[PDB]
Amino acid sequence: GAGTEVQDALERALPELQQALSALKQAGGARAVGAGLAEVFQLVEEAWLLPAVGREVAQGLCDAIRLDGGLDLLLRLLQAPELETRVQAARLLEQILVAENRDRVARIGLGVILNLAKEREPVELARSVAGILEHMFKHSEETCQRLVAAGGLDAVLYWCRRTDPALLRHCALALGNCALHGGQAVQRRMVEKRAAEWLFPLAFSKEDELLRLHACLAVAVLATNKEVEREVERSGTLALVEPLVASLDPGRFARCLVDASDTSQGRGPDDLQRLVPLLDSNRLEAQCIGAFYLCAEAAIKSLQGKTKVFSDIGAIQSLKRLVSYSTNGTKSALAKRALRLLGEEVPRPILPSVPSWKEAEVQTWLQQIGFSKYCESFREQQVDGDLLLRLTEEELQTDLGMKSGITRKRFFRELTELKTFANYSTCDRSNLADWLGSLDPRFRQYTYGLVSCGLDRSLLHRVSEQQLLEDCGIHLGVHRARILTAAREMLHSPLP
Amino acid sequence: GAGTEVQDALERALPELQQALSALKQAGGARAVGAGLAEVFQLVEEAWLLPAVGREVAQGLCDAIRLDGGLDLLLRLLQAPELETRVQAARLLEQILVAENRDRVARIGLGVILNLAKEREPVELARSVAGILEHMFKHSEETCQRLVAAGGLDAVLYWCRRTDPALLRHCALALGNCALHGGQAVQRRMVEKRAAEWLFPLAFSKEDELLRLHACLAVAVLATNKEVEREVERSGTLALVEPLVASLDPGRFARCLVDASDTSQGRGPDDLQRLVPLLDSNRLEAQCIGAFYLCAEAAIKSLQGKTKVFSDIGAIQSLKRLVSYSTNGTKSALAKRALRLLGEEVPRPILPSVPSWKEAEVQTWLQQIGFSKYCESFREQQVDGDLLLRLTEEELQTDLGMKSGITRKRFFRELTELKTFANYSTCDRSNLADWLGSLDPRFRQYTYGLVSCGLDRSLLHRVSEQQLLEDCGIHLGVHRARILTAAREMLHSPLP
Amino acid sequence: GDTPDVFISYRRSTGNQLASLIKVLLQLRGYRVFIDVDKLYAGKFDSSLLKNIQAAKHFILVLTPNSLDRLLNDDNCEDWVHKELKCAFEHQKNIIPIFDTAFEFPTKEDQIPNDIRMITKYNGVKWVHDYQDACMAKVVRFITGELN
Ligand SMILES: NC(=O)c1ccc[n+]([C@@H]2O[C@H](COP(=O)([O-])OP(=O)(O)OC[C@H]3O[C@@H](n4cnc5c(N)ncnc54)[C@H](O)[C@@H]3O)[C@@H](O)[C@H]2O)c1
Ligand SMILES: NC(=O)c1ccc[n+]([C@@H]2O[C@H](COP(=O)([O-])OP(=O)(O)OC[C@H]3O[C@@H](n4cnc5c(N)ncnc54)[C@H](O)[C@@H]3O)[C@@H](O)[C@H]2O)c1
C-alpha cells in the first residue's frame, strides 16, 4: 500500500522540520528567524507540491507545527516590528491553515490577524494576510462574524482596488468563502458593504479565468440569498456570470490533476454540499455556476473513482431537475455533462405543453421526478396531461395508490413546478397565466384551474372566494385572498 | 479491601479525638479551651488532608464530634466573651459542617451563627464565620430563607469589600451556594440586595482563578432565573463570565486530584444535578460556565471510573444539544471535550440552512436529537428539509409511525428548537424571521410557515386569524392573536 | 443615555481590586461607570478605550503601589496608563486621582512625562480601607467637578 511511502516521506520531512523549528525556538534576531522561517516555509511548500499525495505529508507538517512550538511563535513573529519577520511569518502561516490550525487561531490570537489587516500597504504582507483571511473565513459562522465586525472584511474589500494577481485571487476566494460560511447575518453585511460592486473588477478581469470564476461564485452565492438579491442585481456583477460560465471548460481541473489517485485537487463533502443549493436556486446565474463547479468536481471524482458522494449530497436529483425544466443551453450542457461523467442516465427535456400531453408524456415525467414506482398506476388509470393538471388529493390517494400523505405532499411539490413551467397556449385565451404570475410567481400554477372553469381576465372580477376554492382548486386561503383582491382592483380594465 | 485501612486510621484518630474532646468538657478557662480546640482542629484538619481517603476519616471525626459533646459545646464557646475562644471554636466548626452537622446546627442555635455575623471586624473570626455561612447556605431552602431574612446574607455582602483571600473565597462560595439552594424567594432578595454588583470585584480579581470562577458561577446561576435576569445583566458582571471560562482548563481539577481512587475532589449527584439547568438555560454565560464545571467533573469522574452518573443526571443529551445548536466556540470546545472524557460519540454541529437540507441531513438530525428509532420511517418516506419544516401532527402519526401523542409532543419540542435556530435566507425575502423574533423569540419558529404561504412584511397586515391557523400552521391562539395584532399596528410602514 | 458618567483608569497589575471596588460603589450610587476589563491574555491594545475616555464626563485614576512605574521615562507614550491620563488631560476632563493608603507619587518628577506630570499637583482622595463609604462620599464631592 502506497500509504507506507507517505510515512517514509513524513519520516524524511519531519526531522528536517524539527531542525528548522528548533532553529526558530531561540530568539536569534531578524536574520536568524528570517532564515528559520524560510526553511520551514520551503519544507511545507515542498510538501504541498509533492505528486506523491503531498496534501497528506503537508497536513502532517501542519500537525507537527501545531503540536510543537505551535502557531504561537508564528503569532508572536507575526507582530514583531521587523517587516521581514512579519512577511516570513505570514507567508508560512498562509501555507499551513489546515482545519485544526484554523481551529487553533480562531481561539488564540485571532486579534493579531485583524491587527495585520490594517497593514494594507506592503504587498508581500498583503498577499499573505489576504490568504490568511481567506482561510479564516472558511472556519465557522462565528469566525466570520468576528472578522466582519472588525476590519477583516474591510481589508479584502480595500485590496480589491489593487492590481496584484495573488492578492486579488485571495480576495476573490475570501469573499466567496465568507459568503459560503458566514451565514445570513454576514451576507447582509457584505452586501451593505458593497461587496457585489467590489467583485465587479475581479469578474471583469482579463488575464486570469480563475480570478473571474472565483469572483462569479461569490456573487452567485450572494444572489441565492433572497433578501440581498435585489442589491446584488443592482451591482450589475451578475450579468458577467453566464457569459463567463459559457466560455470555460469543466474538464480543465481534471487535467490539471494527474492520473491514478492524485488528490492534489477535489472538494470534500462539506465543500461540495454548499454548491448544491446553487442548483436549487431560482437564479439562472447561480444554477449556471453551480452546475459548472459541480461538473468540474464530477470530472475529478469520476477519475478518482469517488462518485458515491454525489448520490447522498443529493446532487443527482438536482442536476436531473436542471435538465428536465431547462430553458437555457449553458446550464443544460453543464448539467447533462455532469450526469454523463457520473454515469447516470440523462433525462430528455420535458415538453412544456402539459395540457396536450398524452399517457406517454405522463409516464416520462413520472420517471424523471423519481415517482417511477407509480408509473403502473398512472398507466392503468390512463392519466394524461389534462387529468394530471387536475389531480386532487383524493384521486391521488384512492385511485393511484399513493397512501402516504408525505408522499402526496412531495408529488404536489413536483406537480407544482410542472404547472409553473407549463405552456398554456391551447387553453388560456386571455393570458391569465401572466396575470397570475405578475402578482406572484407562485400563483402561475393556478392557471389551468382558472381557465378550465372558464374564467378569464374579463370575468375574474366577479369570481368569489368559494369559487376559487371549490371550482378552481386554490387550497391556500392566503392565495385565494390575494388573487381575489387583485381581481377586484383590476375592474378599471374590464369596465371599458 | 482498602476500607479496612480507613478503619485503622479511624481507630487511631478517634481515641486522640476523645482525649482532645474530653479536654474541652471541663470549663478549663481561655488558655485550656484554646489548646483543646487547637487539638481537635489539628486532628480534623489532618483527617481532611489524608491522601488515604481523608474525607471518610474526617466524616467519622465529624460524626464523633456530633455524637459526643455535640456541636453544643462548640456553639457555647462560639459565644463566650474571649475572642481567642470564639476564633478557635469558629475555626473548628467551619472544618466540620458535614451534612448531618449542618442538619443539627440548622435546628439548634442557628441564631448564634447569625449573632457572630455581626462581629464583622476580626479577620480570623470573619474567615471562619464566612466559611460557616457558606456551609449553612448549602443546607436547605428554609435555612437560606432564615439566613437571608436576618443579617446572614448582609455579612457576606459586606465582606466582599474586604481584601482577605480566604474571606473572599468563602464569600464567593457562600453567594453561589445561596443562589443554588435558596430557591426563587431568596434569589430575588440577593439581586435586590445588589449581590450581582458585589460579585463584580471577586470576578474581576487577579491573583486567584478560583475566586473569579466561583464568583462567575454565582452570577450565572442568578442569570438563569428569568425574573432577575435583567438586573444581573445591569450589574455588568455577566460580561466577565465567558472571557474567564475561555481562559481556564477543565483538566486542572482532575490533576489537583491524584490517581487511583482519590476522592478528595468531585461533586456528588445532588451537586452535579444543579449544574445541568445551566446547560439548559438560554444564557450564553450560564451555558459556558455550566459546560466548564461539568467538563471538570467529567475529567474527575472518568479518572475515578464513575461515569454512570452523567447518564441519569441527564447531562449527556444536554451536552449533545449544546454541541448540535452551537454558535459559540468556547461553549462548544467544553461540551465536546466533556463528551469525549465521558466516552460518548460527539455530534457534528448541524447545518443551519434547514430549508435546503436533503434526506441525509434529516437522518443526521434525527440521530442527534435521539429520535434514531424513527430514522427508517423518515428515510422511506423521503423526508427532506422542506418536508420536515412542514410536518403536521397527522403526518407524524400516520405516515411516519409516531403513534404516541407524548412522543409527538417531544418531537415537536425538538423541531421547534431547529425551526428557531434555522437560517431562512433562501426563503425569506422580507426578513420576516426577525420581525417575528422581535415580538417574541419563540415566534421566530413560525417563519417558514408564513413565507411558504407567500406572506411577507408588506402583505402581513392583511392576514386573518383563520389564515394564520390554517395556512401558516400557528396552532396556539395566543400566538395567532399577538402576531395578528402586531401586523395591524405595523400598517404605518406598508402604507408609504 | 448610553454614555458613561465616569471612566476608571487603573494599572493592570496592582490596581484592579480598588478599581473594581470604586466601580461598584459608584454604580450603586447610580453613576454609569466604565472600566476597560483589559486584564486578560489578549490585553495588548485597544485605542477605543481612549474614545471611552472622550465619552465620559469624569476620569478616575486609581493610584496604587508600583502603579506609575511604566510612566517613568515613557517619552514615547507606550504605556496605556500614560495614554489614558494623557487623553483625559487633552480633552480637559474632570480628573480625580484616588490614592491607595500606601501610594505616593515618584520623587523622579522629571522622569514623569511632560504631557501628564501635572497629575502630581492635582487634588485627590486618600482611600482608607476601613472608611470606604466616607472615602466614596469624598470622591462624590470631586464628581461635582474640579477642573484644576
Ligand atoms: N489543501 C491543499 O491541498 C493545500 C495546497 C497548498 C497549500 N495549502 C495550504 O494549507 C492550508 C490548508 O489548505 P486549505 O485551506 O485549502 O484546506 P481546506 O481544509 O480548507 O480544504 C482542503 C481541501 O482538501 C480536502 N481534503 C480532504 N482530506 C484532506 C486532508 N487529509 N488534508 C487536506 N485536505 C484534505 C478538503 O475536503 C478540501 O476540499 C492553507 O493555509 C493553504 O494555503 C493547502
Ligand atoms: N468535603 C470535604 O472533602 C472537605 C474537605 C476539607 C474540609 N471539609 C470541611 O468539612 C465540612 C464538610 O465539607 P463540605 O461542606 O464540603 O461537605 P458537603 O457534603 O457539602 O460536600 C462534600 C462533597 O463530597 C461529596 N461526598 C460524597 N460522599 C461523601 C462523604 N462520605 N463524606 C464527605 N463528602 C462526601 C459530596 O457529594 C460533595 O460533593 C465543611 O465544614 C468543610 O469546611 C470538608
Author numbering:
A (entry chain A), B (entry chain B): 56 to 551
C (entry chain K): 705 to 852
Give the original sentences from the paper that presented this experimental model:
Wallerian axonal degeneration is strictly reliant on the NADase activity of SARM1. It is therefore intriguing that the endogenous ortholog TIR-1 does not support WD in C. elegans, despite its demonstrated NADase activity and overall high sequence similarity to SARM1. We find that a series of interlinked molecular alterations in SARM kinetic properties, the order and strength of oligomerization, auto-inhibition, and regulation by nicotine nucleotides set the two orthologs functionally apart. In conclusion, our investigation into the absence of WD in C. elegans has revealed that while hSARM1 ectopic expression in C. elegans neurons leads to axon degeneration following nerve injury, the ceTIR-1 does not. Together with structural and enzymatic studies in vitro and in cell culture, we have determined that the stronger NADase activity of hSARM1, particularly its lower Km value, is the fundamental reason behind its ability to induce axon degeneration, whereas ceTIR-1, with weaker activity, fails to do so.
To assess the activity of assembled C. elegans TIR domains on a stable SAM scaffold, we designed a chimeric protein with human ARM and SAM domains and a C. elegans TIR (h26ERL … DTP562-ce709DVF … QQR872), simply designated henceforth as “CHIMERA”. CHIMERA was expressed and purified in the same way as hSARM1 and ceTIR-1, with similar yields. The structure was refined to 2.7-Å resolution and allowed a better resolution of the ceTIR-1 TIR domain than that reconstructed in the intact ceTIR-1 structure. Apparently, the high level of sequence similarity between ceTIR-1 and hSARM1 at the TIR interacting interface with ARM allows the C. elegans TIR to fit and dock well with the hSARM1 ARM. Like hSARM1, CHIMERA showed a significant increase in NADase activity in response to NMN supplementation, indicating for a TIR release from ARM inhibition following NMN binding to the ARM allosteric site. This is consistent with the better SAM oligomerization scaffold in CHIMERA that elevates the local concentration of enzymatically active TIR sites. On the other hand, the Km value of CHIMERA is even higher than that of ceTIR-1 (which by itself is about 10-fold higher than that of hSARM1), affirming that the Km is determined by intrinsic TIR domain properties. Nevertheless, forced oligomerization of the ceTIR-1 TIR domains in CHIMERA and the constitutively active mutant CHIMERAFP255–6RR demonstrate that even when fully oligomerized and not inhibited, the NADase activity of the ceTIR-1 TIR domains is intrinsically weaker than that of hSARM1 both in vitro and in cell culture.
